A paper describes a structure:
Coronaviruses are enveloped, positive-sense, single-stranded RNA viruses, and their genomic RNA is approximately 30 kb and contains at least 6 open reading frames (ORFs). Among these nsps, [name] and nsp12 (RdRp) of [name]-[name]-2 are functionally and structurally conserved among these viruses and essential for viral replication; they are considered a potential target for the design of antiviral drugs.
[name], a dipeptidyl bisulfite adduct salt, exerts strong inhibitory effects on picornaviruses and coronaviruses. The latest research has shown that [name] can also inhibit the replication of [name]-[name]-2 in Vero E6 cells. Moreover, antiviral treatment with [name] led to a full recovery in laboratory cats with feline infectious peritonitis (FIP) caused by feline coronavirus (FIPV). Here, we evaluated the antiviral activity of a remdesivir parent nucleotide analog, [name], which targets the coronavirus RNA-dependent RNA polymerase enzyme, and a feline coronavirus prodrug, [name], which targets its [name], using a mouse-adapted [name]-[name]-2 infected mouse model. Because [name] and [name] target the key proteases [name] and RdRp of [name]-[name]-2 replication, respectively, their combined application may be more effective in the treatment of COVID-19. The combined application of [name] with RDV produced additive sterilizing additive effects against [name]-[name]-2 in Vero E6 cells. Our results showed that [name], which effectively inhibited the virus at the cellular level, was less effective in vivo. However, the ability of high-dose [name] (i.m. or i.n. and i.m.) was weaker than [name]. Moreover, we found that the pharmacokinetic properties of [name] is better than [name], and combined application of [name] and [name] had a synergistic effect. Notably, the low-dose combined application of [name] and [name] could effectively block [name]-[name]-2 infection in the mouse upper and lower respiratory tract.
Residue numbers in the entry:
A (entry chain B), B (entry chain A): 4 to 301
Write the structure that this text describes.
Amino acid sequence: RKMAFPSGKVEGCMVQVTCGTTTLNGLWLDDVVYCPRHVICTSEDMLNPNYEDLLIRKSNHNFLVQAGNVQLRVIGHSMQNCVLKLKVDTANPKTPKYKFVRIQPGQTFSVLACYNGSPSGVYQCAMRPNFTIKGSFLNGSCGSVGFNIDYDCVSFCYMHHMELPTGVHAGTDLEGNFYGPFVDRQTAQAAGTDTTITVNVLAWLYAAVINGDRWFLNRFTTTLNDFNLVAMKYNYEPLTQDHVDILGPLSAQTGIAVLDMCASLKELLQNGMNGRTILGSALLEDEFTPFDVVRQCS
Amino acid sequence: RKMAFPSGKVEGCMVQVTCGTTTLNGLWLDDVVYCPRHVICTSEDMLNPNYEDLLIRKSNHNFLVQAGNVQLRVIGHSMQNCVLKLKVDTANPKTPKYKFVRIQPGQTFSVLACYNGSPSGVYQCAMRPNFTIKGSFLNGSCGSVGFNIDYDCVSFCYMHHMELPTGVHAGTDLEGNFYGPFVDRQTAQAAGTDTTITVNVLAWLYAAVINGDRWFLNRFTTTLNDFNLVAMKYNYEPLTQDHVDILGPLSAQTGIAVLDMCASLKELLQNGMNGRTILGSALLEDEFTPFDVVRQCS
Ligand SMILES: *[C@H](O)[C@H](C[C@@H]1CCNC1=O)NC(=O)[C@H](CC(C)C)NC(=O)OCc1ccccc1
Ligand SMILES: *[C@H](O)[C@H](C[C@@H]1CCNC1=O)NC(=O)[C@H](CC(C)C)NC(=O)OCc1ccccc1
C-alpha cells in the first residue's frame, strides 16, 4: 500500500492568507506565516509580475491571516525567493518540532492538500526526475505543503504554487526556491521529459522478495553498465553506486546483492509481467523509496 | 490519486492498551477507551478463547492504558461483542464530534495504522463485497480504526482485528460486530469469493475522462438490465438504480449518460484493455466511490 504520514501535526499549522481577492494557504510555525508570494498578485499581475514592486505597495494591513475565523495580526512582511513571510503577533502553540529541507528527485513525501486553510485530504507522492509531482490540486490549493516525519520532527520539503500544462505540479522548498526550472508566473512552461526512478523500482522488487511472491524472480545476472542500456531505453534514471547502499538494508535482508535484481527488471522491460501483477500493481511501481519499503515491512 | 481524509482528529484519540503480555491500540473518546477484546487473551488463549471466561477472570488493574506518556486509570470495563470498553477517570479533551457507523460493501474509509498507541501511517480502503479489506497491517496494529469525515464529524466505521491467510484483513464496526463471517479466534478462516465493485469502477472511468483519458469511450448504449447480465459473468456486483442516481453528478459534469458509460465498460469486459492503461493502470480500479471522485475533482 501507498501510505501517508499522519497529518495532525501539519494540520495544526495551516492557515488562510488573503490579500485583496486571492486566498491561499499559509504555514504557521512559531510567529511566522509562510505562503506563496503570488498571493499579492491580482488576476493579471500573474502573467508578468514584478513581485518586488507589487510587494512595495503592500503593507502589513493588506494581509488577512485567519486560523479558523480568528484573525491573526500581521506585524511584518518579507519576501524570500518565491515565498512570503508574514510575522504575526501570536506564536502557533501547535508548532511541531520541525525543519526545512530540500529533497532530491526520487525522494517521497506526503502532501496535505488544503483549501481556504482547511485540510481536505492527504496523499503520498514523489518528486519526479523532472521536478514535477503527480498530485491532485485544484484552485485555492497553493500554499499546501509536503512533508516527512522522523520521530517527532516534521521535515517540510514542498509548498505548492502551480499546475503545469500536462496536469502535474510545481513548487518550491520552504525557502521559496522552486524545484526545477519553473517560475511563479502564469505562462506555458516546459514540463520536461521524465524518467523512471530506478532505485525505487529496485526497492519495490526487493519488497516482492521479502513479502513473498517473487515470480518475476529469474535466473540471470548482469553488472552495472549494460543494465543501464536496454532500460535507459524504457527511460530509467542512472542508478549511481550511492543509491546502491541506501538499497543496502534490503539487499542484506533478502540476501540479494543489487543485481540478480537488475536482471529481473530486465525481463519486465523485456517481455512485461506477462499480464501478471507484483504486490498489487499490474505495472512496475517507482514511487517507493527503500526507506518506504523498510518502514512498511517494519 | 487515492486520498485519505486528514487524520489529526483521530490521532488525538489513539492510546495504547495493555493487558499482561498483550499490547494493542485503543480509541479514546470522552471517558471511554474501545479496543479489540482479544487484548485479554494470551498467545495460547487466542487459539480458542471463551472471552467471557477470560473477562470475568479480570479486574480493572489488569488493563494498562497509556496516552503518550500519561497513564489513564481504568475504573470500569465491559464487553460489547468483539470490542472491550474501558472506562477511565479522565475524558479525552481532544475528543472530536464523532459517530459510529456500519458501512456497506463498496464504501471507502481512511485507515490510521497505529503501533503502541502511536500513529504510523494513513491510507484508503474499501469494504470488499466479501467484507474483507486489502490493508497494510502488522503485529501491534489491532485497535487501529477506519473513518470518514463529514465537515467536522469523524464517523468511525472499522476497527482492526485480523489478517486472513490470503493477506487481506478483517474486523468490526465500533460496536464490535465483524464485517463478514469471521471470528476473533486465531484459526485459519477463508473469506469467500470476492466480486468487483461496479458502481466504483464507473466512478473511476468518469474520473479518467475528467483527467483526459478517453480512449475507452464507445458510442454504443445499453439497458441497465442488459448491463447487469454481462457484468454478472465477470463477477461484477449488480448495478442498482440507486447506484445510477449516485453517478448522476459525474454524468452531468462530463455529459456522458451512466448507461452509455456502462456500454463502454461492457466493451472493456468483453475485449480486455489490449495493453492500454486507464489513468496509468492495467486493471480497472474499483476502490473509488462516486463521492471520492467528486470530492477530489471539486
Ligand atoms: C494556486 O492556488 C494555484 C494552483 C493551481 C490551480 C489549479 N491547480 C493548481 O495546481 N496556482 C495558480 O493558479 C497559478 C498562479 C501563478 C501565479 C503561478 N497559475 C497556474 O497554475 O497556471 C498554470 C496552469 C497551467 C495549466 C493548467 C492549470 C494551471
Ligand atoms: C492484532 O494486533 C493482530 C494484527 C494482525 C497481525 C499481523 N497482521 C494483522 O493484521 N491480530 C491477530 O494476530 C489475530 C488475533 C485474533 C485472531 C485473536 N490473528 C491474526 O491476525 O492472524 C494471525 C497472524 C499473526 C502474524 C502474522 C499474520 C497473521
